[PDB]
Symmetry: C3
């Protein structure tokens, strides 16, 4: 009934490509270990934000530091049911690290599932494990996979995934939902109950992980997931903020990935949605002022549909007056808004704790994604069974 | 550093600023330096930190999006230690905004401090997000107050008579409680606090012009400009080829361990009058911020002409840091005495001037009509010496 | 017959204005030493990237850290034939360091050549060594030079250079080609065979040094050098990336100087050039997918004309199929591409070593520009003789 999965990490792997699988898979009940050659449990890796700005290739800036939870030197490969390889700029050097090539060789000859995304596939080409195997990758990776005897599948769109028995591949983090889903299925997983429409209340400078990880995690299960922002329409984008904890008395801020909205705020019917999700960051403080944002929250809470809100997301719940006589957590500073909103505080120590009060699920910040999503799934009647 | 018990004199005051990591860089530095220029001793504390430690600050600006964006501002060095504060010694409390208030508001020792200060009745001036701490200290029930618009629901839930800020410069006073929405309200915010402190301003019916440019230093424009507006001066800012409501990007210059200063983007700065409509003889004084604008401004003939016009008629001219490149190039420093950013001693000496060593770095000097400072730490003496030339006084 | 040259460095000196002469002059056979007061050999200076973006003056971001190879305190000036002084924001504080003014004064009295660029000339004003001498500089440096008695030449375009006897000046890094050439001449050097046409295959996020250093070194020799990028015209620009080694397991990335293309990609005829150069960075991975790019590379390789590729540029050669049975080095990660493209790997140890195999020169990364450009010159019949 359970699984354990290894993620092969390195310096400047793409932030989304490690974090989404890492937390979506934990949310689904699987144990996940992260390793990097040369590093031990509790070391960190810098990450890359790869995005487009209309140049002929992607731009890069720094993402959240990513703290490993395991020690590469001590990994016993027989304890793992599958392997995940994030993209970004880590694979190109990990592909030349003898200890990584050996690990990947060994894991591939066991026949266990390997899910590899974007530049990840370079490590597979170096390990010579793709001969006669069908696979996609970031388009610039295709020549090397071709030269390694792969059956290359040109990614006609950025969300393309390929499955070839135990080999799962994707081109970019845009393919995360099908990529993760195909990997869960490869592990023997069966997903039930995912026929749900979910709405995300987004805004500018919401937190980069706190929108993308729950959004993709729920898509991977099979949910129809929509993202709205007042005054914007489908295909408009929201800048995002990366909040990290770099030793000051509060978090740091830098730009994250831009995030594509999918539907029109004015067009929305709340009745057609099964649940609401509220990312944190700096959008909730201003969304908390929009009446139509408050009306939507009031409708869900009234009708006892699941509402999941994380971190600063609870500022909109408090301002809507829907926290009265309710129990919830939030970012520690947002305890002010919870208590002032008539709510009872649940203490987020450690900061990845999440809580359920009837139809309301709350978390405190991005480390809490596994619990946040898991507890949302329980309210939605979604199960992953092995 | 300041003489730390000076505000105890009868004609003076001591004010405490409640600081924290990622407080808004203007909302700490402008009252920190304006209040000193007005003859007030100011202490700065952060919970869990001591005198001499420093706090990161946030630069909060708008850029076309639905809420502000942020980058790092100047590091701010504390001059007092939080857990040795004797509250009974302070006549006033200032609370900056930015990202510090939300966590300070959940710090028990900070809430204890604002409660205790609140029941004393002495003036509290809180700006932008600072007001979150007041909500948490429960000190606003039935009191009139404004704040950044997003601090609204909290103030209301704490029983405030909330005043939605219609424009970003809105300020509210309810007895000794003074509140502003954003730094755009600094001039009135600071004026109202000075007044609540018993301060009386005389002589401030003056017109003052700032010679601005791209990548001028962020504090060296903002601080003198808003300090002078807080006195009730009409202050205008011009840049060649730009007009009213155009903006200049600014540079944050700080010292971070290398043999010279580092540079990062600062806040954008709005010019107030057209470069070409301006009538320079209608101004009482000239101010020249530093940074990297002066080196290119020093090549503009209209800029040099305005400089010669003021020095000619012996009107007050205040220049700081690199500003003195413009003066040197204008030929107007010949036989004159001044300081500058240390590097700019080259320009001063080459311009026939006599060098006044900026030691310590916050020292400013006056030679007749000419006030000069070396860098942004010198703003208290810099605005003080310009006030004394203009006949402006703040009296307690 | 050789020459030893000193470069007077400081913190926040302009990245191009130290690196370009540092590496061109070594390529030309000259020994170059780099010093900064208060620092010893093996210490580093931060650098500034000064670029234009439509504001009324330049903007600044951080460039590559620069490692000094000599110790200021230990300089014996009678052993240097020439002196170079980079611009940026270092000269303004350098000009008030008494040991720096003394050094320049002593050097100037000897009548030996001094090349000073941009803001560099502030130190000359401070040293009072410009009275009656014809010089240019960055426009904002004019009044100081005039006040020091200079015969000022207002730079009308950013590439203006002036030579007055042993004094060579330039206004900006746009003037590097003539600036460097004039300095080589002042040292008694004679350049022969540089009447060649060279084509740089450029792209977005190519590496900042890897385009600029080889490009401007080739121009300083007298070569006509064109730069092209798919879908772009003469006058278009590419953003560049700065890759530096800052203690992580792979390089960091930050924006570099934007680079102007000189000629239209679509009109281009490959046969009208004598040689090809390919910079590294992140452009090669995407350029390797462009058919016309690969056609240009096959034409040069087939006709056996000199081809010089550095770092990641070899991704393009490899995809072109032209590394089959060839010998070459590349950025270490790029070995995957070399081997999979049928090449024989040459270990770039030390990292600044370059290799020639017939018409093909390869280097591993920017530290290798001295040998990269030296070996290209050898194939083109270009020489610098003293």
């Amino acid at each position: 009934n359970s699984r354990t999965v290894l993620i092969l990490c390195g310096d400047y792997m793409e932030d989304y490509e490690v974090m989404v699988p890492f937390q979506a898979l934990q949310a689904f009940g699987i144990t996940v270990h992260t390793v990097c050659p040369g590093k031990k449990a509790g070391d960190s890796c810098p990450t890359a934000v790869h995005d487009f700005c209309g140049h002929q290739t992607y731009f890069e800036s720094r993402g959240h530091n990513f703290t490993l939870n395991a020690t590469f030197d001590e990994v016993d490969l027989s304890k793992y049911d599958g392997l995940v390889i994030p993209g970004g700029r880590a694979p190109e050097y990990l592909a030349l690290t003898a200890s990584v090539v050996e690990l990947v060789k060994e894991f591939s000859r066991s026949g266990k599932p390997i899910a590899s995304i974007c530049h990840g596939q370079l490590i597979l080409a170096a390990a010579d494990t793709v001969n006669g195997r069908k696979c996609t990758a970031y388009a610039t990776v295709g020549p090397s996979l071709v030269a390694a005897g792969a059956k290359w599948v040109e990614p006609i769109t950025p969300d393309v995934c390929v499955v070839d028995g135990s080999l799962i591949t994707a081109a970019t983090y845009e393919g995360h939902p099908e990529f993760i889903q195909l990997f869960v299925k490869a592990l023997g997983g069966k997903i039930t109950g995912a026929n749900k429409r979910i709405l995300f209340l987004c805004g500018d400078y919401m937190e980069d992980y706190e929108v993308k990880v729950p959004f993709q995690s729920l898509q991977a299960l099979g949910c129809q997931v929509d993202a709205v922002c007042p005054e914007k329409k489908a295909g408009d984008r929201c800048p995002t903020a990366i909040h990290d904890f770099e030793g000051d008395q509060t978090y740091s801020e830098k730009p994250g990935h831009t995030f594509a909205l999918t539907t029109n705020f004015d067009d929305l019917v709340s009745s057609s949605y099964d649940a609401l999700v509220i990312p944190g960051g700096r959008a909730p403080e201003y969304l908390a002022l929009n009446e139509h944002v408050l009306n939507i929250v009031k409708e869900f809470m009234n009708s006892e549909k699941p509402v999941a809100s994380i971190c600063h997301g609870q500022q909109i719940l408090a301002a809507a007056g829907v926290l009265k006589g309710r129990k919830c957590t939030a970012y520690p500073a947002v305890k002010l808004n919870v208590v002032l909103g008539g709510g009872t505080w649940l203490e987020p120590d450690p900061i990845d704790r999440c809580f359920t009060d009837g139809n309301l699920v709350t978390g405190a910040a991005w480390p809490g994604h596994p619990e946040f999503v898991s507890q949302l799934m329980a309210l939605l009647g979604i199960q992953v069974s092995f």
